[PDB]
Design an enzyme around this catalytic site. Structure first.
Site, PDB file in Angstrom:
ATOM      1  N   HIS A 136      -2.965   9.827   7.778  1.00  0.00           N
ATOM      2  CA  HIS A 136      -1.985  10.175   6.709  1.00  0.00           C
ATOM      3  C   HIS A 136      -0.727  10.854   7.279  1.00  0.00           C
ATOM      4  O   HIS A 136      -0.351  11.954   6.826  1.00  0.00           O
ATOM      5  CB  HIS A 136      -2.678  11.034   5.657  1.00  0.00           C
ATOM      6  CG  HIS A 136      -3.635  10.277   4.807  1.00  0.00           C
ATOM      7  ND1 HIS A 136      -4.979  10.320   5.019  1.00  0.00           N
ATOM      8  CD2 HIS A 136      -3.436   9.431   3.774  1.00  0.00           C
ATOM      9  CE1 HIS A 136      -5.591   9.554   4.134  1.00  0.00           C
ATOM     10  NE2 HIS A 136      -4.666   8.989   3.360  1.00  0.00           N
ATOM     11  N   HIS A 161       2.139   5.994   8.697  1.00  0.00           N
ATOM     12  CA  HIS A 161       1.585   5.512   7.410  1.00  0.00           C
ATOM     13  C   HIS A 161       2.707   5.459   6.367  1.00  0.00           C
ATOM     14  O   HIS A 161       2.779   4.487   5.601  1.00  0.00           O
ATOM     15  CB  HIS A 161       0.415   6.383   6.971  1.00  0.00           C
ATOM     16  CG  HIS A 161      -0.080   6.065   5.604  1.00  0.00           C
ATOM     17  ND1 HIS A 161      -0.799   4.919   5.322  1.00  0.00           N
ATOM     18  CD2 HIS A 161       0.002   6.747   4.446  1.00  0.00           C
ATOM     19  CE1 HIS A 161      -1.116   4.899   4.042  1.00  0.00           C
ATOM     20  NE2 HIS A 161      -0.637   6.005   3.483  1.00  0.00           N
TER      21      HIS A 161
HETATM   22 MG   LIG Z   1      -2.299   9.685  -0.634  1.00  0.00          MG
HETATM   23 ZN   LIG Z   2      -1.150   6.763   1.504  1.00  0.00          ZN
END
Ligand SMILES: [Mg+2]
Ligand SMILES: [Zn+2]
Ligand SMILES: Cc1ccc(C)c(C(=O)Nc2ccc3cc(-c4ccccc4)nn3c2)n1
EC number: 3.1.4.17
Length: 313
Positions: free
Chosen positions: A68, A72
């Site tokens: 994350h 991303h």
């Molecule tokens: Mg998210």
């Molecule tokens: Zn995401």
């Protein structure tokens, strides 16, 4: 105004494809995002100086977590670019502006932990936001960065255009809460099969933008096999860290998050492709026919996971 952005020839060609990988050179990701905004929106959608200062503050506010992270954010924004470019006439000037920004910002200040871990830990963010805990944080961080000096990329919009675009960005970020996805797809499925789906119904557009956001957010499962397989390592690195933290609280984590159950990974991928990914891209191909390549790539990758189980790799 006469300044464009150009990529090298391979990126210029490959970037239009759904399965594009933005590559390992971090310092090229901002130029990739700007290039996508200029062809998606216009060279006039944003003041270049403001957009760049916005991109760098957004980057700064993504953390160094395994999955994350900033890569991303840009990967998810590239998926949205591909959907918008293959569905040119369907979306307004404001939606194209708002959704690429929503995608870049959708996971701002993520710590690598599910909403669930925040609730069991009793994180302060779970007191402030009872549902879609991280997703209301991410929107909150987006508004904060937009209010920094020199960072209002929407300065040239009217009062009511500005409010429309922040409302698009808010619904888009909330919709990345995968817990909301199941109902949202079920309702789109019913609305499409009984022919009630109407894109001039604002509550219908909202649902469709929601599904696009889910599809872009999961686009790891729509890359070529070597990219999908290597990305799964980052996804599980976060899941297993969260599992470790559950054990620290004295809670047996679900097997998805238990690093003692690495053996069961390939069968866990099957379930996720069957329950979430395929239904997501199926319903999306039905509402937006040109997004079919995402469905095809997802099926290809399901087939690759079945081969992993069958000892064929
Ligand atoms: Mg998210
Ligand atoms: Zn995401
Ligand atoms: C949000 C998102 C985006 C992309 C991917 C690829 C995943 C993802 O991988 N999701 C899932 C879902 C369920 C599930 C069960 C398992 C399992 C592992 C080991 C032993 C037993 C079970 N893994 N797993 C993984 N999730």
């Amino acid at each position: 105004g006469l300044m464009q952005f150009t990529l090298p020839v391979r990126l210029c060609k490959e970037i239009e494809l759904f399965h594009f990988d933005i590559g390992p050179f971090e310092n090229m990701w901002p130029g990739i995002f700007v290039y996508m905004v200029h062809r998606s929106c216009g060279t006039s959608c944003f003041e270049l100086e403001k957009l760049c200062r916005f991109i760098m503050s957004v980057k700064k506010n993504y953390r160094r977590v395994p999955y994350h992270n900033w890569k991303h954010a840009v990967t998810v924004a590239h998926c949205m670019y591909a959907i918008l470019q293959n569905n040119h006439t369907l979306f307004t000037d404001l939606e194209r502006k708002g959704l690429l920004i929503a995608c870049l910002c959708h996971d701002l200040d993520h710590r690598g932990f599910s909403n669930s871990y925040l609730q069991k830990f009793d994180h302060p963010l779970a007191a402030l936001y009872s549902t879609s805990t991280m997703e209301q944080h991410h929107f909150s961080q987006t508004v904060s960065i937009l209010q920094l000096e020199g960072h209002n990329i929407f300065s040239t919009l009217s009062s009511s255009e500005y409010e429309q675009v922040l409302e698009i960005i808010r619904k888009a970020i909330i919709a990345t809460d995968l817990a909301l996805y199941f109902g949202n797809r079920k309702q789109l499925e019913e609305m499409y099969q009984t022919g009630s789906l109407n894109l001039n119904n604002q509550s219908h557009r909202d649902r469709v933008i929601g599904l696009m956001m889910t599809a872009c957010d999961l686009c790891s499962v729509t890359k070529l096999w070597p990219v999908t397989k290597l990305t799964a390592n980052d996804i599980y690195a976060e899941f297993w860290a969260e599992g470790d933290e559950m054990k620290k609280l004295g809670i047996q984590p679900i097997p998805m998050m238990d690093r003692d159950k690495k053996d069961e990974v390939p069968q866990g991928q099957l379930g996720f492709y069957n329950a979430v990914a395929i239904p997501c891209y199926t319903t999306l191909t039905q509402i937006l026919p040109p997004t079919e390549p995402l469905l095809k790539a997802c099926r290809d990758n399901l087939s690759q996971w079945e081969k992993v189980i069958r000892g064929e790799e």
